[model samples]
Target: FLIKPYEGESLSHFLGRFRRANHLSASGLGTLAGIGAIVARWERFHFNPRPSQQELEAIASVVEVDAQRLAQMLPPAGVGMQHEPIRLCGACYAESPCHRIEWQYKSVWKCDRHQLKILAKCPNCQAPFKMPALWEDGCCHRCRMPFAEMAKLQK
Candidate 1:
């Protein structure tokens, strides 16, 4: 069985942990699950599309978790009131794959855990965070800034 989902773990965070533990790339996990790269995009919150029950079952089978549990960890669709972009706390991302659903809210300007301002753009190059589907790593591909390092520099 896979490791139990950590308390308050989001679906994306759990997937990241699973991939890291299994030493699988997003595509690799997709291949293993026979679901293609959709998992990668979903984890990144790019499109936030609702997966069918069959899709969820396929992923849960590969991840070795109950499909219902996996469904519970996923964010609800239509929560984005006006299509506001997602913001991220570097510290939280460094500590875990913490792309909390609340970060997509317009009023969430700070990370409660890290007490740091969430950023929408790369500090080094001022580039907007790429779409979730494009975020292959934990850092900006342009400036190559380690997101974890960025967390350390924050006040």
Candidate 2:
């Protein structure tokens, strides 16, 4: 449920509260100036100033909060929404979510050693695999499968 707004607070400030709660590094105002503007240019529901329903939903997901609450925080599309955090790999900053790998009981995001580690698994056999220390695209040692095939399986 959308909580009641605090006294003297506007939608921008209310949405900011959600941003803070989510650990998003960008300030609501900064994200408003940056990501908000980008989403404004591409949204489908309203004019340049208006935000789309889908866009609003995306922001809520990035902010790790409720869409309705994010909606109430904004004026509307052209009105504006909070900035969505750019999800990046902690290791390589690749444009993909970090693969959650387990070491012991803890899970880690990104390649274990920055961009140097080759992590893999056999799709045909479901066996754990690793890249060679020197070879970038070497065949999987266990199944003799091409690296390209393993790459596809990694995804």
Candidate 3:
């Protein structure tokens, strides 16, 4: 009776879409799932205290996604991620309209899928991207530059 998940969708984007579609709040989802601010932290990709199996199942039950499928939205085990600067691949975002997990990897600087440099700031106005969950416009929040258009700026 609500929104469905997209392929390779980031947790932030997926959670954000679900909440907006169902008219629920982040904390509301936490409370409903009994996971509290853990929801907020994941929206920001703060996995320092990485999600536990039990916790995954808790949210999965509420979101209706398999716990293991939801876990795929997380940083892969043993792969270090740089959560800051919240990177993007404009070309990829153009196709998927959601953040992919691979972009934040400390070892990743390019989108192997699109062969484009990942973007951390708006090429037109230098604004750092807002978290993927807040990616309502799919454009620069400050400059209103379309993310898909920014792919030309990718090098």
Candidate 4:
């Protein structure tokens, strides 16, 4: 089994950790789970089109985690949760994966660990930050700003 999940970790973090550990691409994991490439969307917090129970079970089985427990860790559906894009702390994204779910809440305007204000848009291009699941090696998709480097711009 994989390392016990981080406390209060989002499903995206858990799955991303799994992907890294196994050296699997997001599409690869989706294919292995029999869910098609769209599985990446769930990791990005686009849950309006949530995965079916069978798909979840398939992923859990492949990851060797408990299906019921895995389901419990995911955000509840149909509550209008995460409908808006999320803010991200570049430092946190540099150190770990983004989209902690906690960051998406209004109360979380700063990164407790890095003491930096989270950014909602790219500093270079002014484009909204892409979802953590879509992050390619911790850089913004539009302008290729290294998310970790943005931490230096902080006061």
Candidate 5:
């Protein structure tokens, strides 16, 4: 079981209480399973052995803490979302978001970091190419030109 800090208590003090509650020796616990030590690679959360409902109740009994309180501190479930930043094509000058197309005939755009190996087609040329997420002042690949030149061509 893990202990989180109370209103005014520091993490260190709470950890001390945690160690004492577990009946684990300072040296043994530190060497074998440090109560207050960094246990996981990720810092956002800690790993607690999954205990059965009865086992959790027993541990709560031994720890003298409310099982509900412990459950609140260590939620049994979690969730999150991921997003890749939108990019601008250095070659095609196609300012758009990068996404996979399901249409079989459609081509996909990649990043310019690939060195032109993977290309997201230029909307103008239909040439396979990729774009840099952030474009300063650059040119397109197939046309070997910049946006300004393309504007002139369009005119």
Candidate 6:
């Protein structure tokens, strides 16, 4: 009924994993939490009207994660986010197997840990990366190339 969130895992990924683990759909979970369609928007990272504290508590109750801890899955105050061309570090994904919340920071242009440029599209097929919630196989949806296969080219 619960999925342990990976360190720095994006809320989108965590939400998807949690839902699948509990055999619930977006609407089903939202209905249980009384949060409405917001979960659908959140799964796509559409956080325009940022999720509030009470809302976090609602989801926290259903997901069995602490509200404060669940809050960490979201962008910190004043840290701008990049919602388009969802980018990621293949090496990071290789090591962690989940999207990191930090990857969406507007100031992040490279993976400091891996010393590699973040990629917006698949290196092999150029298909744009999908939202983390939909990352079932952790591979390029078009080319089917494992994200871990991306070369560590210097930025």
lDDT of 4 by residue, 1-155 (tens): 36566544566767777787788888999998888766687777666556677878888778887777676556544333463565667777666655566666645677789887778787667788655555546677877878788777654
**Predicted candidate 6 versus true structure: per-residue lDDT over 80-105, tens digit per residue:** 88777688788888888888888888
Off by over 4 Å in 1: 1-28, 36-49, 81-86, 105-107, 131-137, 152-155
lDDT of 2 by residue, 2-80 (tens): 2344332223334434344443433442364345543323221123455556656666555454567645433433433
* Per-model TM values vs. the true structure: 0.63, 0.27, 0.94, 0.65, 0.26, 0.93
RMSD to truth, every model: 4.0, 17.4, 1.3, 3.9, 18.6, 1.4
RMSD of 5: 18.6
For each candidate, the alpha-carbon lDDT, in order, equals 0.69, 0.37, 0.85, 0.69, 0.34, 0.85
Which residue pairs in candidate 4 have backbone atoms (N, alpha carbon, C) closer than 3 angstroms, thus clashing?
none
State candidate 6's TM-score. 0.93
lDDT by residue (1-155, candidate 1, tens digit) is 36677544556667777887787888998898888888886776555567778888989889888888876665455444212364567888777754555566555678888788877777777777654434557887788997777776565
> What does candidate 4 score on TM?
0.65
Tell me how candidate 1 scores on lDDT: 0.69
Model 3 has a clash total of 0
1 versus 6: better TM-score goes to: 6
Give a tens-digit lDDT track for model 5, residues 1-155.
55543432211223345655565543434444323233221111223454245534543554455556544433235421111122233323333212211111113233333233222334367554331211223455666566433433331
- Superpose all Cα atoms of candidate 4 onto the true structure and report the RMSD in Å to 1 decimal: 3.9
Candidate 6 segments exceeding 4 Å error: 151-155
Q: With candidate 3 superimposed using the best TM-score fit, by how many Å does residue 106's alpha carbon deviate from the native? A: 0.6
Q: What tens digits encode model 3's per-residue C-alpha lDDT throughout 1-155?
A: 45667777888878887787777788999998999999889888887788898889998989899988897887677888776888888898788788887777899898898888899899999999988777887889998999999999999
Number of clashing pairs, model 4? 0
State the lDDT at 116 in candidate 4.
77
